[PDB]
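The passage that follows is intended for readers who have already worked through the single-chain material. We present the inputs for a multi-component assembly, then the predicted structure in tokenized form, and finally a short commentary. You are encouraged to pause after the input and sketch how you expect the pieces to fit together before reading on.
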Amino acid sequence: PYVRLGYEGILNGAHDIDVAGLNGVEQLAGKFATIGANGVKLAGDNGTNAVGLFREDLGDMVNASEKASFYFRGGEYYVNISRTSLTAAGIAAGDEITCDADGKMIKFTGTGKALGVVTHVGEYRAGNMYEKATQGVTDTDTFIGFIMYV
Amino acid sequence: PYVRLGYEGILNGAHDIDVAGLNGVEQLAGKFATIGANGVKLAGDNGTNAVGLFREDLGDMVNASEKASFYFRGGEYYVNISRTSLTAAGIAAGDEITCDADGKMIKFTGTGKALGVVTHVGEYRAGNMYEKATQGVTDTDTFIGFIMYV
Amino acid sequence: PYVRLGYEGILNGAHDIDVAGLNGVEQLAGKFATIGANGVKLAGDNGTNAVGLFREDLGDMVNASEKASFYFRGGEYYVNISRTSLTAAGIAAGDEITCDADGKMIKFTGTGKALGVVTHVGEYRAGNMYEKATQGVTDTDTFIGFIMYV
Amino acid sequence: PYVRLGYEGILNGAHDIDVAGLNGVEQLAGKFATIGANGVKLAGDNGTNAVGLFREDLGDMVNASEKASFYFRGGEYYVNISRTSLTAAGIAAGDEITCDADGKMIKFTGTGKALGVVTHVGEYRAGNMYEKATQGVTDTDTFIGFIMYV
Amino acid sequence: NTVYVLADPEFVGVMPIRQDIQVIPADKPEELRLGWVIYEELGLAVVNSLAIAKIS
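Having made your guess, compare it with the prediction:
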């Protein structure tokens, strides 16, 4: 039970190329996932989490950062974007994830404000100030989140 | 590189050395077999490894998975090349071991065959689906102690 | 030239290579140190120093924090090849600086598979990996200033 | 986390009030359109009302809900003839509204039958009195934001 | 005269709270400082209080 078995739909889209300049990969480089907590539902589609961060390692696995319970490092620090397939389609859970370094498209599931980015392990919150951008006149907090980078 | 130095056993064994008949993808780059901490020849939780589940650690060493959850095992992995003699057939002692990327058999002991978790032993066991990864659509036979091709 | 380091003033006795990424290129430009919002009365001298373990904690600004060993994950190293002179003082603005890591090929430290770690200011030390680590897991043909993809 | 409900943070769209039934004509014995039902501009509770339904509390002013649901009186629940509300406060057009009393489609609010008391968020819920006068469609269990024909 | 026109009812007064038990501040060394008050307004003569806009 739960999505993330067989060929399944998408949250972050499919087969994205040219989605980032110098801050994200533009060639397809996807690779399979060893997952952390994805919350009430496996491989996301829910309030808590939505499919967390991966960071590339040597081999045919990419795996968890894993940042808990929602810490963040600014500029580049790797986010999971789109998925690829070869025997199963869908965003993580033993299926191929394409990553970037903070590129597009990111599209994670929340209630209200925050949203933000999700890792594995924790509830859906958004990073603050001295974790993402505290450049110029900005409001971001743990009560305040929108889908994209701040 | 490979060496017949140090300790030629697999500590905390159950099957010990194992030889996978299918060759996967090469990733012969050198690295130490010093478990966890660097220069710690052998340590608690060396586990039953040889062509088992592995986790690389940041630095200059590769070692046992040493984790009981949150890298649930579905998709591809990391493997030690057993085609080269190595210290045993996988991990143990210090010194340079060549490892590779998945496309080799690994060993379970659970009722995993299509749905997986991570054992700190670096053996594979049964998922449940809820936050645990899915290997492929692929089936292998369950008899316990059997070698599944991933 | 020579020894200049200003006075009109071009050498600058410090050369740091912008290594273009792999599979679609990635760059990151040298970062300033500023605490929150953008620096007033000039922006001072760079937060990044050639041969130093830094982490961005802000979008255009880089700061202290040291990546802890154990379980292999991505970059945030920003090692830049060492300059000649000023190697235990950091590197001052008007000399060559960049950031190298995170979605690009990097600059490595340490000769052989024997590695240790780096101090911020541009010095190298010995040390085994046991509460901190720097640079990716060692590979074949890895020396100082060598190009590892991480 | 954190989700507004009512009070001008929910969008309920727009619906046509000249659809279904007989349609009267423009005449007096109306009442005024404002936010608040005895309040003042920029201070009013609001249901899941859009177009259709608004009950006077004090003064001869309307906005959604608020009035004891033991006894409904005034001639129907009031409907709009030949202006369609362009707000989702229920009605709050900022004009004097000429009202009607022919059979006319409304928007409801609150779970369960209106035969109860008022919740001060702009909703109906069950009170200690039962078998009190209902609104619109009968024989049919009404829920929060149902479309009834009077 | 400010006192006359309006009056300030206070539901709860200004209080600081500081949280290292909040999710995102805990993980980090960071501490979150909240400053808040919950207020309300009374109008004792909102039907008067003279105002002008220059036309000069």
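Commentary: The CA atoms of residues 105 and 149 of chain B lie 4 Å apart. The interface with chain C takes residues 28-32, 36-39, 55-62, 96 of chain B (CB under 8 Å). How closely did your sketch match?
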